[PDB]
Symmetry: C4
Subunit: 92 residues, 4 copies
């Protein structure tokens, strides 16, 4: 549980560092600085406008942007679910 | 204890809707103008429908730290709702 | 499980009958006929644009529309989750 | 059997993306123009992001029965994904 939350924080910072670098100059409102990146990736993780709102606009400049976001969604959504289940299981 | 979980959620929902009415009511009246409008918006935000693009990003354009309220709200309420729904299903199977 | 799926089908038809009647004349693209209603309520159940896309526009004509949709979401989302868990538990 | 579940999902994803490319490719080329565009749209539809307002409702304006493909697709894939993720967590706890 504590290790799961630690893994998620590491992945969140590494991904937000990568995203700032990859799409920061082209998409500054969403990935302009580490803070803007951490906010966008949290939004993308919850799945709110991930494609129509973020990825489809991003792919119009970077056609492979899906190689970053789709694996990010698969990894973080599974981890978040696994973490929440882990909290409930340990408390019981 | 299921009933206590639902009670905790109702308290958190009213406290948050009181806080939100005060924080964003004057600037964003269609969404947080009164306690009722606030309770509706926070239910929407809790389900995750247009939470960012639709609500938080427009709210952050006036209040840049609005994320300090909404992100912890989402983390707390979504976990509690999940925990509550699991608790109902687990207790009904045992009984 | 079979009874859960049966309860959901009854609730889906009753709600789509109610919705056709309540918002059919005012919102015909979404609730014009039982079919359009069953499609909208399935969308609302999955939570896609339930508020900004459907309920907020509907509330502008019917200010209490939330008394129908919010309890509908609470009932159907819980039942769907309970049904899917029930399938997985019975198969194991 | 986890590995078989992931295998079933991949088969369903390719079959559905083949079917969708054929059905809506000429009418909706930005979303279903090629197998790649189709696999991306169906992943989006599977996560439920703008599935109706963004994709299906525009698609139904040309193909009124499009719901016969997408609604069963959502029911099948979302259940399988949930079942797969639960299967991973259950097997890791047992081992
Ligand atoms: C799961 C973990 C998710 C963490 C999410 C962190 C979000 C941080 C967002 C943020 O702070 N900003 C980007 C907004 O998108 C910047 C501004 O809103 C504002 O904070 C600044 O101007 C200054 O106040 C900094 O001191
Ligand atoms: C635990 C979930 C609790 C959800 C509570 C939803 C409250 C709905 C609030 C409401 O009635 N309105 C706000 C929507 O504008 C409309 C009124 O102002 C008029 O009827
Ligand atoms: C969980 C259960 C969810 C059931 C969902 C059922 C959706 C039915 C939607 C539907 O069929 N239509 C509304 C579209 O919103 C009508 C048209 O698309 C079209 O079917 C008709 O014109 C004729 O073909 C009828 O024979
Ligand atoms: C099991 C989930 C599988 C998801 C598979 C996503 C495939 C992404 C498809 C893709 O590469 N593009 C489609 C997006 O337009 C862009 C290309 O056409 C160019 O690079
Ligand atoms: Na969702
Ligand atoms: Na959603
Ligand atoms: Na949306």
């Amino acid at each position: 549980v504590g290790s799961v939350a630690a893994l998620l924080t590491v992945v969140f910072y590494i991904a937000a560092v990568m995203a700032t670098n990859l799409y920061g100059a082209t998409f500054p409102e969403w990935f302009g600085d580490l803070s803007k990146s951490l906010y966008t990736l949290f939004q993308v993780m919850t799945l709110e406008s991930w494609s129509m709102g973020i990825v489809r606009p991003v792919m119009n400049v970077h056609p492979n942007a899906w190689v970053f976001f789709i694996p990010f969604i698969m990894l973080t959504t599974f981890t978040v679910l696994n973490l929440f289940i882990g909290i409930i299981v340990d408390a019981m």
